[PDB]
Amino acid sequence: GSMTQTFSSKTEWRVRAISAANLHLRTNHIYVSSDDIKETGYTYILPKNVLKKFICISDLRAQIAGYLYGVSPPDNPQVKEIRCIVMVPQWGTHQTVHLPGQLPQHEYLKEMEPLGWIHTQPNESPQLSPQDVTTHAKIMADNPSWDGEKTIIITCSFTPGSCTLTAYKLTPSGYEWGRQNTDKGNNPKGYLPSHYERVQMLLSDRFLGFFMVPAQSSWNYNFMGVRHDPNMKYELQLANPKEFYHEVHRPSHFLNFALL
Amino acid sequence: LAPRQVLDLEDLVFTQGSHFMANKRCQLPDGSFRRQRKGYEEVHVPALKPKPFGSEEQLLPVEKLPKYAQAGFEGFKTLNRIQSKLYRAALETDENLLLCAPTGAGKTNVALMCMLREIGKHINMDGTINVDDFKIIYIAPMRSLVQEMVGSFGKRLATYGITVAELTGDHQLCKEEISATQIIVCTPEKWDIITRKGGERTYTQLVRLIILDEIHLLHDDRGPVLEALVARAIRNIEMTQEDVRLIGLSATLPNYEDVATFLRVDPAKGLFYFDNSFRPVPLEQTYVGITEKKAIKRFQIMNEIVYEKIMEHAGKNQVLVFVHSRKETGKTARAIRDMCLEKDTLGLFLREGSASTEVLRTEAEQCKNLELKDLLPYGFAIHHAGMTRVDRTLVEDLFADKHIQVLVSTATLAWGVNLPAHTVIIKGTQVYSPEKGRWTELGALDILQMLGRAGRPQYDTKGEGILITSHGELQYYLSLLNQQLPIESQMVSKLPDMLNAEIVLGNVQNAKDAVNWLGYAYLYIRMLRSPTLYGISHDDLKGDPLLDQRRLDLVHTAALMLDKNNLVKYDKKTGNFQVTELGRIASHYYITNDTVQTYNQLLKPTLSEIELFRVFSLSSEFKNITVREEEKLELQKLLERVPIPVKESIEEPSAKINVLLQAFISQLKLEGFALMADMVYVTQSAGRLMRAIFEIVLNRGWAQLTDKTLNLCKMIDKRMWQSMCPLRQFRKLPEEVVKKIEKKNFPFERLYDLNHNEIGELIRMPKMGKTIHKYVHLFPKLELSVHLQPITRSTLKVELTITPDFQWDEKVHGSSEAFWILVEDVDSEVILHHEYFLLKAKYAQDEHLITFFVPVFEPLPPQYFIRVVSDRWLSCETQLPVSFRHLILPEKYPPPTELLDLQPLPVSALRNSAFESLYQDKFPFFNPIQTQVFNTVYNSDDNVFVGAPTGSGKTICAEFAILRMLLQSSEGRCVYITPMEALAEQVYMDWYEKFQDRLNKKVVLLTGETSTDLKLLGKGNIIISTPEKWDILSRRWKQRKNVQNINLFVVDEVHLIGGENGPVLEVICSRMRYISSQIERPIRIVALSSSLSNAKDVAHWLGCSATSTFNFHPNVRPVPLELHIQGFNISHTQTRLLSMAKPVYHAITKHSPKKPVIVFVPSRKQTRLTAIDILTTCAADIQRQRFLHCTEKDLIPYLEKLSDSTLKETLLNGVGYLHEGLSPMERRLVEQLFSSGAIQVVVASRSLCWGMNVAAHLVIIMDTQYYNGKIHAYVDYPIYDVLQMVGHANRPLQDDEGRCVIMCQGSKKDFFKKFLYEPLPVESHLDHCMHDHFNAEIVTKTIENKQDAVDYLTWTFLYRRMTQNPNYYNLQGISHRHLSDHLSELVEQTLSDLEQSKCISIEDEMDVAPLNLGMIAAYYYINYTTIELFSMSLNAKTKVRGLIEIISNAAEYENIPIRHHEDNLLRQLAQKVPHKLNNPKFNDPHVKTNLLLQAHLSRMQLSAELQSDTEEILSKAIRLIQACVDVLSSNGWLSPALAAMELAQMVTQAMWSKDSYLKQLPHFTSEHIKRCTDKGVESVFDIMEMEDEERNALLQLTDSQIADVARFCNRYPNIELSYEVVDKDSIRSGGPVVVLVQLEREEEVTGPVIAPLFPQKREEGWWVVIGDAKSNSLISIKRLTLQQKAKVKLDFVAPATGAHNYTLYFMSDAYMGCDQEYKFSVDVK
């Protein structure tokens, strides 16, 4: 014999939405890991305002990514000031992000140079992901405007009560390994720490960046993943992005509640 | 009173509200008896006997009522006994009344009689009603009753043309409701919330009568609302000294005499008590009190009792049963119908074969509900609020026919439908209250109303009310229905909220005010009369007989509560109360004070939707909500599906509130009476609670949270989430379609780009591709574009263009559509700027222009954002990114010129005795600035610029320049332009004393009368003028020598080139430069200005060498300026002024407690209010009368010369005021008292800040916005006025310093810091004002082709500033290509407009030439558009009728204000005027001036405002009339031109063509004109020719008045006219004919025209008109001015030979009846 009890659902995205509402406290505690023995290549200056907005629109489990666009201070070709973050239609897991194949295209970015991408990560990591090496290399192979000596990966790792940023570039050998890689697991054959190196990065308050977002939709498709396609096309607009759990990212929750 | 005590308000509260029973015992009328039954007792009370008529009382027939009030009793014969006892007190007096009568006894007809008395006060002589003169408030407790009352009063009063209406919901778009209505019917709460806001031009100043219906509501938890209303009303009476009549209608209950005291009712005049025997139908009562406690069988007992009682009336009587729910109505109807079926009794209800059974079967088969058809053929029915209007009407019309036997219903029918029934059964007295969170008893008003419905008034000899309740409640209901349940006050709990409302309004500024206010509460009366009931011992009362100490303690306790929750800042020692924005929001949105404390605690800019919904759920309005066990499973079913996650566990009431709101937006239906009721209660409050949150976060600038909370307001209003297809908001669209669409999952926006075909395909149902299309373009949608205009490197001016991009349809858009304009920073985080925008239907197709300032910084941010979002439409917004990538900032302004520490310059440096005689008495030395500029001004002819703050003596510098002129040239001409007429007049006084009195040159002040001004320019050495009086003059410079012979040209306050009237000043300065370059003999220019950042642009524009431009910045002012800017957080203007009231006083004591103070305030009314407020503050302070510095009796010879008594009292306590509506001698007295030191403070209105001959040690600027009535909006003070006000804090001979405090809305604070501590950048706006000057310069032949226009533009300041700040003028570069194209475009557009108007001709698209219209527009200085309208409207057949119409329609006169308070004053005016106008709209300045001109022609004198308005209409009327004369004459039209010529005279003298010439004579009245026209005298020469003694004999006049008559009779024109046709014996057809006329005045020109009723001094003008009267043909005309003797030549063409007999006309423009006529003839060959 036995007794009798009934199941009341406990959906995970609600705990995540509550948690994401508190992301703003991390923006007052952002750290840049400076442990590179010597800088390799350039110095990247990320404006604080877009970094903090990028933190506030993210999720603690599902990675988001944004493309980096910038220029060099007039007399200093070895500094790259990050001037814009582009959010494109995307979805993610805790280990990787899925972006479309098409890179941002817009008149406002035409006098800027692509500097790579930024993405969030649940946990700090001594090494750059092989997912990230593969993503950067496959982008480089599809798009020759991405020079390996100039484009970077900024990871924003969620460390307790805070955020730690670290910025990497690919190496020739890293590019060549990542473009041919098809094992998407945590330990693909061939992966080496000689595939990437750490570039210097600074957080600045003296200038402001801006955002570009899609024109006909938003950027978050983690609740609509079906509608997301690697071959999908999109235009952009000068505007600031909506937070991860904003209503227009999860319309099915609102319509299916009103059902019953 | 210091020994105070803090009370526990909650311990004093009557917990049971209207169910509190203050009486200990209950005596029933004789014959009551008590039946014992099983488990329930019954009490029976027999019907009462009426006393037939009492003692000598008879029924008044309507015929003996006053005649004006009979119409309101149409269809009745005589009033009933109540109305007959009341008609004298109600109709024949204004006495406040209290009528206590049993419900349905006739009280509302007594209210109608009071209303009619009020209405009678406004019947003018035409019989209609000045329905703009009054308002009547009818406060009814329930909404259904409100609606019924609107209907029935509307019908009774429709014969009077009176509007009766209710006030519905949204009132920030719909206050026109109140203007359109004379009788406003509403609930207590609605009128509370409306008068809580106040606002200036609220129509609550017209309230004459307040009717408080069912005033025994005082005993209810809602009663404190009535107490707040009455106390507020009586306080407003005290303050504004207007009287308002108060009328109470009550049930018959104890303490009515206390209620009478509370309404200020005289018990011997206004109190009437009619006991329950005066009920229309006597009432047999049965009370059934059940003892059975256990619920399940108590329920069956109840249904058994009701079945038995209903059986007692089946087939004899209809039975109206009352139940507590919309659901139990059908449930109970069916319960008893089924118990009837079970026992075979339905045959009793409908006797067989009846017409009734057939009628009911037919109507139940035709009309159908669910239960209504399930019941109607039986004789049953139900009625409630979820029922169709037509089905309610069906139930009502069938019951009225006596067809329904058992009708089950709710209280709504009791209140809103006039539907009685012989038997009434109230089945149970319990109801669920969500506010209380539990079951409670029915309120008293409900019970009284329902049992009032017992017994049909004409069909029944008695009613039978049967009340079923719990046994323990019997004594209560027995008391209620038998005159024994006392009316108590429930307000002790609401005291904090009510007190805060009065503090927010400013009615209560401290604890003494609050004590006096509380003494108007009904609580106070009941405390005095029964202290033990309210917690006061009898010995506490004998030691405090007025309850002063007790009221102080209550007010103390409440004020401490409000201060702890931050609604109020309470200074305990002084008792002073300071308002806050949070307090204001609590009051204006009807939020309880604990709730805004929560909102202030939890609201943060980072808040998410999750936390916002939780903040909402924590409102104190929900403090009694609980989570019930039976609710928990359904609440969990919802809490796991909610789209907004809830952090709280389900055990928390806040989680339940959260889930109920979310379910409501999702339109979920729940199971559970409690949960549905609780959801209704939660969401009915959500609207205004969320609107309060939205206001808090918007005024804090919190961009994201503002967006979230405005969205939540709209999601609550519309019952849907953003995600849903916005098309749902078109109720009239089918839902299956929108579901198809939003399922198709594609952006709504793309639907705009398709057509009916493609959308019909995209949704897969093209059947209605057109329909969707319609709605897609009915959805509100705005297009935005921006012009950026850099002011500096850190302040940016934005001009937003809003273009509507949708079809308007008043079925969905109403009459207006509201939006928020939000200007947000780079990160969409801070609202840098926001404003309300209203798109009115009449403007739904026009571009709307908005302009504002936003700060900016370097390095420039990427962009800002401008959002325009609908105030009520979901998913309705346009965002315009404003990128700064291509913005051109102006360069940093250059440093000032250094102030040189020079030896202060002695007056003796003038090296001239006579010259030094002007200053040596006044001071020994010139200040540092004059000392620095002296050598260049006095010893050089260089053009010079002096920039420096107001109060640096720049006028003395221009005086240096004038004196140099007088030494160079013994007869030099100087012209001095200042931009304001009041400045010109001050300068004219001072310079007349200096240069004419002392140096004996001639100083003259231009009047605007061009011939006078030309003679002044000819004879004067100093010509003082405003810009336009110099524009009209100096246009004609090629023909006028005295214009070019000018030695010196001085322009003062030249920074006003940048302000509203800058263009004309820029034009005249540029012209003086051009003229100097033409005549090649230079004209020296001296420019004086406030400190300017772009000073060098002005100096270079005026040709001032850099060494001769002195550009000082504000730090050099000779009297140092301590400027303080305090910001004020309150965004509502009346409350912000309130929060400034006391800081004004504190500023006086801190910065100038001994020394003189000016306070500038935004309006006329405010000057008086603030003088009194300052006085109150210093009285309640220690230092009373501290601002008077002479004695109380040295003043009174000054004082009696005044009329304003308030001005007298304030002046007595040392405080004056100045405003525009004061007589000039009153203002002169206040100025003389102020400057003499007698009074220390003067409060002056904004508009007088240029013509004030006083200065002070301290200037306070109290707020920096004024209300403009034309645009119905608050406008910022121009920076120029603020600089002028600040300049008044400067006393060089008396003070070591000047101090100024500017109090402003906080959002203006930093702006003032940038534009006061730093010099001012000014720009041209001439590009916006081009046409009239271009036209002048084409008339003058200065511009003859487009090249000339481009060149002439290069002389202007606009051309200089187009290079320094290109973006400001909409250039994108500064290359010569750029401005060449820009100037060409400007020129092409201006010339094309002029050519279209037919002012100029353009040929070969290159050569321009003046036309006659343009010549007229330029000559008389008239707007080119006006002269175009004039070319349209005038024909060969106009006369004095058409002319007034045409000239009213002038661009010069559309600036005439239209204030609502004249909309009947003119309506009757338009009736007393001789010319009957055509189709009157009354929101038109052109019609307004038409009627003001017919007023002036008839000599009707009106108010001071309408007089002020006519006095400036008259200053342009003569130009306009002469322009018409010129048009009509050029065409060839004789009759209309002669008519306009006489209209010139008519306007001058203020008479008509029909009126008699003697009306022109001083001191002449109508009786004199009668005794003149009788025998002997018809004209003015008739009076001159009479004998001197017979003159006095007929005149009946003083000798001073006879000298006044003689002055006119000797200035009256008498001219000998001769005429001859030169060579009249040699006239050939088609040949020249020259006629010569000669005019000889008998005694020359003594002086100007005598025209006391015309403002400007005129000089006589004359026309010579040769025409032929038959042909309506004018063949020649000349204009002449006559000085004794003058000859005129008129040449014209002869026609072919025939019969031609001409008339010569000699016509005046000034006097009437001097027009001479000489007919003559010439033989043509």
Ligand SMILES: CON(C)S(=O)(=O)c1ccc(Cl)cc1
């Ligand atoms: C509570 O406030 N009102 C009911 S009121 O209609 O606005 C009013 C207006 C003027 C005066 Cl003298 C008295 C009362």
